[PDB]
Design a protein around this ligand. Structure first.
Ligand SMILES: *[C@@H]1O[C@H](CO)[C@@H](O[C@@H]2O[C@H](CO)[C@@H](O)[C@H](O)[C@H]2NC(C)=O)[C@H](O)[C@H]1NC(C)=O
Length: 264
């Protein structure tokens, strides 16, 4: 039995839900309290009776505040995760710096007085939009212990991610002119190792700003990815393999079926 399964058996409805099965509360981390990042908001399930939860850090992109990705906080946390949406030290920080700040935000959770006993410190993930998604890839390349990475319309000058050993969902926007998929998202997917559990999801007709207000497709598959890999929850593979049928997805590539390591 998988000790990390949380919540009821999922359906497409449950992963599309704006609020998941877990009631959530929040706490604020000021810049003074934040070593190595610009502060943030932590969303967490109040129900402790099922055990601890994996942790997720989410970064905004260049010139953007926490507000540009804040909606992901409660939407993911209510599926059974402790999620910190960060501000960066400055809004002009570059992608690798954002990766270091994502890692610093995860490390903060380990001793945060409100959530330190709610996280499993060894099951953590990174996400981000635009340069923050470049940061998510950078954090994974710099920390092979991370359990999942999700760049959303990621932007980075580094195109080669062959050293990443963290299951990665790359979400591109078809009509993105800021981080065009042909030179950013798709190139990232192509250079991730072939033996990695990975997927590329292109959002039909979408512009760069698709991640800055609620997008059900982004939320539902981020949730399924975090469940499948942060929690090793095989109940969620059904949504990722075979390729999803959503109209909002114009292209899907993956290494389905994903690896299931076992001692049977
Ligand atoms: C990978 O993580 C390490 C550890 O945080 C980073 O190395 C630090 O980088 C900062 C500024 O970049 C330096 O001030 C520290 O002295 C470095 N620490 C060590 C132990 O070397 C490294 O930059 C990260 N890599 C990337 C690409 O962001």
């Amino acid at each position: 039995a998988n000790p990390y399964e949380r919540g009821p058996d999922p359906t497409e409805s449950s992963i599309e839900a704006v609020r998941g099965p877990f009631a959530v509360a929040q706490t604020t981390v000021s810049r003074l309290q934040a070593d190595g990042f610009g502060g943030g908001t932590i969303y967490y399930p109040t129900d402790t009776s099922q055990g601890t939860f994996g942790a997720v850090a989410i970064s905004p992109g260049f010139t953007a505040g926490q507000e540009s990705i804040a909606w992901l906080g409660p939407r993911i946390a209510s599926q059974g995760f402790v999620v910190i949406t960060i501000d960066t030290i400055t809004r002009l920080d570059q992608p690798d710096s954002r990766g270091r700040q994502l890692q610093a935000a995860l490390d903060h959770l380990r001793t945060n007085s409100v959530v330190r006993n709610r996280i499993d410190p060894n099951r953590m993930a990174v996400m981000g939009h635009s340069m923050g998604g470049g940061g998510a890839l950078s954090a994974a390349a710099n920390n092979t212990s991370l359990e999942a990475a999700i760049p959303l319309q990621g932007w980075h000058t580094r195109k080669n991610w062959s050293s990443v050993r963290t299951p990665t969902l790359v979400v591109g926007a078809e009509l993105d002119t800021i981080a065009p998929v042909s030179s950013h998202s798709e190139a990232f997917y192509n250079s991730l190792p072939s033996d990695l559990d990975k997927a590329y999801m292109e959002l039909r007709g979408a512009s760069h700003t698709v991640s800055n207000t609620p997008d059900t497709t982004t939320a539902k598959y981020s949730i399924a990815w975090l469940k499948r890999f942060v929690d090793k929850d095989l109940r969620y593979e059904q949504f990722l393999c075979p390729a999803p049928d959503d109209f909002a997805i114009s292209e899907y590539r993956s290494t389905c079926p994903f690896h299931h390591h076992h001692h049977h």
